[PDB]
Amino acid sequence: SNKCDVVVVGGGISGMAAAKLLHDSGLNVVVLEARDRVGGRTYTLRNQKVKYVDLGGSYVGPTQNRILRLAKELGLETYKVNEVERLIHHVKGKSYPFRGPFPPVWNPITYLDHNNFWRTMDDMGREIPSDAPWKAPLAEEWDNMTMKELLDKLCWTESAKQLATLFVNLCVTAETHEVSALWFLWYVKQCGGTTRIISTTNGGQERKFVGGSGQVSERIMDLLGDRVKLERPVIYIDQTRENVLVETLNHEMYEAKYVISAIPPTLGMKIHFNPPLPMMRNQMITRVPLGSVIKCIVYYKEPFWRKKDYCGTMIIDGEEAPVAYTLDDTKPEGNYAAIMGFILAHKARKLARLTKEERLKKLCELYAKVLGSLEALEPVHYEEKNWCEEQYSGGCYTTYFPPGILTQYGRVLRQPVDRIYFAGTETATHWSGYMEGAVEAGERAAREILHAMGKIPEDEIWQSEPESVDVPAQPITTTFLERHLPSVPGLLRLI
Amino acid sequence: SNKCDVVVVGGGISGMAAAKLLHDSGLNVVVLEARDRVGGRTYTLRNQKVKYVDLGGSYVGPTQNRILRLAKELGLETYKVNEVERLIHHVKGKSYPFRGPFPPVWNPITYLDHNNFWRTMDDMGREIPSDAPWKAPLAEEWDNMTMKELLDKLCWTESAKQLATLFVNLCVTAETHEVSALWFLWYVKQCGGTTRIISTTNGGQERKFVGGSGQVSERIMDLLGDRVKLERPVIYIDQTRENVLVETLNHEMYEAKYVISAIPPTLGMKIHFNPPLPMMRNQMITRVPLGSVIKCIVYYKEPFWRKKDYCGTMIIDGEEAPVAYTLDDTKPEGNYAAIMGFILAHKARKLARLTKEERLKKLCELYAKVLGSLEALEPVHYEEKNWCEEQYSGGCYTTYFPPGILTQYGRVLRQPVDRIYFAGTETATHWSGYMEGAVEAGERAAREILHAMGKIPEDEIWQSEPESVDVPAQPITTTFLERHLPSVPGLLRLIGLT
Numbered sequence: 001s002n003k004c005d006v007v008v009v010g011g012g013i014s015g016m017a018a019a020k021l022l023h024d025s026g027l028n029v030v031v032l033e034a035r036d037r038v039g040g041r042t043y044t045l046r047n048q049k050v051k052y053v054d055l056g057g058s059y060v061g062p063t064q065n066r067i068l069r070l071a072k073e074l075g076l077e078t079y080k081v082n083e084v085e086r087l088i089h090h091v092k093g094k095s096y097p098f099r100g101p102f103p104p105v106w107n108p109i110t111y112l113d114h115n116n117f118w119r120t121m122d123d124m125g126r127e128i129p130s131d132a133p134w135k136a137p138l139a140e141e142w143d144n145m146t147m148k149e150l151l152d153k154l155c156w157t158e159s160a161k162q163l164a165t166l167f168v169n170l171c172v173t174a175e176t177h178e179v180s181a182l183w184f185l186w187y188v189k190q191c192g193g194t195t196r197i198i199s200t201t202n203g204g205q206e207r208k209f210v211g212g213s214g215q216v217s218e219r220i221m222d223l224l225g226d227r228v229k230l231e232r233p234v235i236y237i238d239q240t241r242e243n244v245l246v247e248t249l250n251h252e253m254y255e256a257k258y259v260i261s262a263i264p265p266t267l268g269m270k271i272h273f274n275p276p277l278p279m280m281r282n283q284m285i286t287r288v289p290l291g292s293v294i295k296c297i298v299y300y301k302e303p304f305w306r307k308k309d310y311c312g313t314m315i316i317d318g319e320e321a322p323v324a325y326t327l328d329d330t331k332p333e334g335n336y337a338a339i340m341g342f343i344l345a346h347k348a349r350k351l352a353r354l355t356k357e358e359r360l361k362k363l364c365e366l367y368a369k370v371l372g373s374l375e376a377l378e379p380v381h382y383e384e385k386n387w388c389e390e391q392y393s394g395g396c397y398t399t400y401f402p403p404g405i406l407t408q409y410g411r412v413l414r415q416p417v418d419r420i421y422f423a424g425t426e427t428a429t430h431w432s433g434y435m436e437g438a439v440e441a442g443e444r445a446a447r448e449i450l451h452a453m454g455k456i457p458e459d460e461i462w463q464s465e466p467e468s469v470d471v472p473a474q475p476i477t478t479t480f481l482e483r484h485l486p487s488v489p490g491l492l493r494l495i
Numbered sequence: 496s497n498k499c500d501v502v503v504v505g506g507g508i509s510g511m512a513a514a515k516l517l518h519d520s521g522l523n524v525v526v527l528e529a530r531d532r533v534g535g536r537t538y539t540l541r542n543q544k545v546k547y548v549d550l551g552g553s554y555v556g557p558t559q560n561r562i563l564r565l566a567k568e569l570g571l572e573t574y575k576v577n578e579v580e581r582l583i584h585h586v587k588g589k590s591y592p593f594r595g596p597f598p599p600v601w602n603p604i605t606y607l608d609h610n611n612f613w614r615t616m617d618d619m620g621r622e623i624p625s626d627a628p629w630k631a632p633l634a635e636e637w638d639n640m641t642m643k644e645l646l647d648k649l650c651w652t653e654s655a656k657q658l659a660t661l662f663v664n665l666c667v668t669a670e671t672h673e674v675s676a677l678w679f680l681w682y683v684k685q686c687g688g689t690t691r692i693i694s695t696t697n698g699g700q701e702r703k704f705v706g707g708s709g710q711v712s713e714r715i716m717d718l719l720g721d722r723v724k725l726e727r728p729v730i731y732i733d734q735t736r737e738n739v740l741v742e743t744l745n746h747e748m749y750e751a752k753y754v755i756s757a758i759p760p761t762l763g764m765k766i767h768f769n770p771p772l773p774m775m776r777n778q779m780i781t782r783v784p785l786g787s788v789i790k791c792i793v794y795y796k797e798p799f800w801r802k803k804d805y806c807g808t809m810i811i812d813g814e815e816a817p818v819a820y821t822l823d824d825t826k827p828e829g830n831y832a833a834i835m836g837f838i839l840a841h842k843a844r845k846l847a848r849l850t851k852e853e854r855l856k857k858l859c860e861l862y863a864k865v866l867g868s869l870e871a872l873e874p875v876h877y878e879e880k881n882w883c884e885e886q887y888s889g890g891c892y893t894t895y896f897p898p899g900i901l902t903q904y905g906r907v908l909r910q911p912v913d914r915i916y917f918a919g920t921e922t923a924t925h926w927s928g929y930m931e932g933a934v935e936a937g938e939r940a941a942r943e944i945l946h947a948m949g950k951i952p953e954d955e956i957w958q959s960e961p962e963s964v965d966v967p968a969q970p971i972t973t974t975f976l977e978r979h980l981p982s983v984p985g986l987l988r989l990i991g992l993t
């Protein structure tokens with residue numbers, strides 16, 4: 001067997017961040033990666049037509065200090081996603097340009113309803129501990145309903161219900177009726193709330209990495225060298241002996257003092273355990289699916305939308321549109337002009353039956369309508385990735401919790417199993433679901449092992465992160481009217 | 496490599512029924528079983544204190560003609576679960592003895608609400624094709640709500656809502672808020688409806704096998720000899736070459752023309768596939784958990800409850816009760832007196848924290864109260880099994896579908912993947928979730944391979960089953976009043992109009 005201090009299962013950002021921290025502390029680490037590549041739910045494709053493109057995770061922004069610090073240490077830079085010109089909200093077949101993070105509403109009843117919906121998501125979040133959502137005072141009540149039931153209760157207008165539905169679908173690549181309300185409310189709150197999660201400027205979509213996010217995982221593989229084993233899917237972990245035995249599909253055996261599991265929780269199912277997992281983890285890993293998305297990038301000769309004072313952001317209501325949300329994916333140099341869109345949740349499942357060229361025509365005709373431009377019908381290139389097809393991801397962006405699961409099983413996600421510690425973005429407490437959460441979780445799991453070895457004290461397991469100097473956060477603000485305007489039933493109780 | 500015609504992955508009833516049919520048809524089969532035993536979600540424990548006891552699937556009944564026929568051919572016999580004396584409904588800390596499959600309701604409004612709840616479950620069921628529930632006219636609407644939401648809409652009384660909650664928990668070892676309404680309505684209708692699924696006499700719980708249900712899988716292993724490979728968990732299936740390659744954890748390689756997957760759908764995740772599964776199956780197998788249950792059998796010197804004119808059936812409402820449902824588990828000879836109970840859904844997770852002795856004490860204290868009998872505090876023996884802990888089951892009794900899954904993914908549950916065909920009870924169209932469904936699915940998968948091989952015509956893939964001559968099925972009937980009494984809102988509409 002190949003002997004080491006710690007085996008890390010999975011070479012995404014979380015496992016690479018964990019392996020780098022342990023390597024830097026002087027331990028002998030091995031990363032066992034199932035694929036022929038690192039990066040996992042990040043994947044940067046290079047070719048002459050695109051230069052580089054993120055086909056998985058891409059965006060970073062203020063308050064994501066860990067991924068920013070790790071990337072800066074690896075020699076990466078960010079650039080700002082284009083938000084200079086107007087955003088578009090496409091409603092009932094017409095484009096309404098706007099500025100600021102939130103699409104405006106003009107009907108007074110619809111305004112109260114929209115204002116109350118976002119506000120209420122944040123008010124509910126204030127009662128949900130980031131590190132223990134199952135401790136919310138109404139945890140059971142909120143876990144036992146879907147987001148569809150909560151939206152049906154809160155939204156008195158169809159307008160608000162449709163945009164809230166889009167918000168859920170875009171944030172978690174899942175239908176409102178698939179997900180727990182408690183989990184979804186946790187998810188938003190642990191990203192800093194509604195404004196922070198939805199915003200480009202001053203939010204999660206503010207920036208991308210120059211040359212692609214795949215460079216984070218690639219550059220840690222560059223540091224670790226032949227400590228990273230590609231095409232080594234882990235099939236078996238045996239904790240019955242002095243040292244932990246980890247076996248791969250290609251028959252190799254690794255012996256370590258400890259293991260970090262840095263794979264999506266459900267993909268623990270692909271490992272046979274000796275002894276069997278404890279009951280709660282055995283069932284948890286069958287209850288935690290990942291969402292469904294196709295990430296699609298259409299390339300053009302020029303970022304022609306900018307000539308019409310559009311930035312390239314589109315928020316597109318309704319069932320017919322294949323893509324509900326786009327961003328400008330043009331390089332910072334103004335070349336490789338492109339629109340990124342996501343095909344979300346059931347539409348990913350529905351439109352996967354088409355060919356690549358059929359999806360390209362649907363997207364170009366949608367963009368031509370919404371941008372009001374025939375230039376959208378003249379793509380020069382197309383790239384796409386359907387993450388539903390990935391054996392070693394299960395989906396994207398992240399794991400969602402159906403009703404009832406977070407309260408019954410959530411405590412088990414990061415609980416160690418003997419000498420296995422659990423990383424992966426799903427185990428983070430800030431920007432779980434993101435590259436930021438991957439770094440937080442990988443470094444925390446690594447420090448749990450340094451503590452088990454008696455190398456650091458308990459109080460160093462969870463470490464704060466200084467704010468990025470390059471990507472400072474500005475405060476989230478509200479107006480007096482946003483805070484105090486009544487809900488629709490509130491306006492009615494006054495009548 | 497060990498070469499054969501068909502590798503069956505899984506030696507539960509479904510895989511063993513598939514392997515037997517293929518063996519009988521003259522093919523070379525191998526069964527690769529992860530555990531050191533066959534039977535899977537069936538397990539008959541033998542010791543001197545119990546003689547035998549089913550700790551997994553046990554009950555069979557009228558309309559389950561495939562399991563009855565298979566067991567009869569293997570030399571097995573059934574006996575009737577004791578339902579001679581009165582049943583008990585325990586609610587708000589008091590016991591109400593009754594006769595018939597349904598606890599009686601005296602309050603007229605509550606009676607309308609109860610009658611309408613069961614009626615409406617079956618009315619909705621008749622809209623749902625057994626072989627394609629996603630084709631129901633309102634499939635999307637029904638799949639996008641939980642059973643909790645459906646009970647909140649239909650039940651105008653708390654009495655009906657509490658009994659309906661117990662019914663869901665007991666039928667599918669899951670909470671009402673965990674499961675799709677479409678999937679639950681399908682599950683009940685594909686068992687023959689509410690009456691058939693809930694009944695002991697004339698329903699699913701009528702009978703057990705003499706000597707235990709594990710004998711089905713064990714007697715098929717006897718017929719197959721060394722073709723059953725125990726402690727061979729399958730890790731890898733490669734379909735890139737002319738013959739399918741199946742690898743086991745203990746390093747062995749099997750080469751076959753076709754594979755039957757006879758494991759619970761999500762346990763397909765334990766297999767690495769080359770090439771990768773198609774997208775829809777790749778995601779489906781992460782979306783389909785199994786339920787949570789501890790099966791607990793408390794033994795007594797005598798079946799003392801019968802002397803109080805109680806048969807041993809208890810329907811126990813209330814969060815404090817660890818067990819919501821019991822049956823008499825006394826042997827047909829009248830000895831090894833015992834009460835079987837289920838610890839359901841969240842209670843299986845909550846009470847797993849206790850010791851075996853702590854669970855025994857809580858069960859005896861509950862039974863003493865429900866039966867009004869101090870003798871219940873004097874157990875002579877105890878056996879239990881928490882199926883949530885089983886790596887190679889995932890839970891019991893069966894796979895449930897959370898909201899939104901059955902319409903989006905259900906079509907691929909038994910869709911072949913190249914030369915992999917899908918057995919397992921979850922793929923049945925009649926008594927899916929049961930030993931009966933396991934036989935249906937195993938034999939149907941085996942016949943899909945016989946058809947692929949040109950040995951049988953397409954119309955022989957799905958085969959009807961003659962009715963058992965030993966276990967006659969009485970029809971499910973309703974009264975005029977059951978059919979035509981209004982719902983509570985129906986009554987309020989008639990009041991508004993008057």
Ligand SMILES: *[C]C1=C([C])[C]=C2C(=[C]1)N([C][C]([O])[C]([O])[C]([O])[C]OP([O])(=O)OP([O])(=O)O[C][C]1O[C](N3[C]=NC4=C3N=[C]N=C4[N])[C]([O])[C]1[O])C1=NC(=O)[N]C(=O)C1=N2C#C[C]N([C])[C]C1=[C][C]=C([C]N2N=NC3=C2N=[C]N=C3SC2=NC3=[C][C]=[C][C]=C3O2)[C]=[C]1
Nearest residue numbers: 010012013014034040041057058059234396425433434435
């Ligand atoms: C895929 C993906 C995609 C496609 C995308 C994305 C993503 C993804 N993401 C994620 C990431 O990527 C993740 O997290 C990470 O990566 C993870 O990591 P980890 O943990 O490490 O993991 P992985 O990678 O997986 O790894 C693992 C590994 O392992 C391995 N394996 C397995 N198994 C195994 C193995 N090995 C060995 N062995 C075995 N067995 C594998 O292979 C691997 O490698 C992301 N992230 C980040 O960060 N970023 C990004 O970008 C991302 N992405 C996405 C994102 C998205 N988003 C955020 C969302 C959104 C968007 C937008 C928005 C906006 N909005 N919304 N809504 C709205 C808006 N706007 C405006 N408006 C609206 S509405 C409204 N209205 C109103 C009014 C008034 C007021 C208010 C309002 O509102 C949002 C969101």
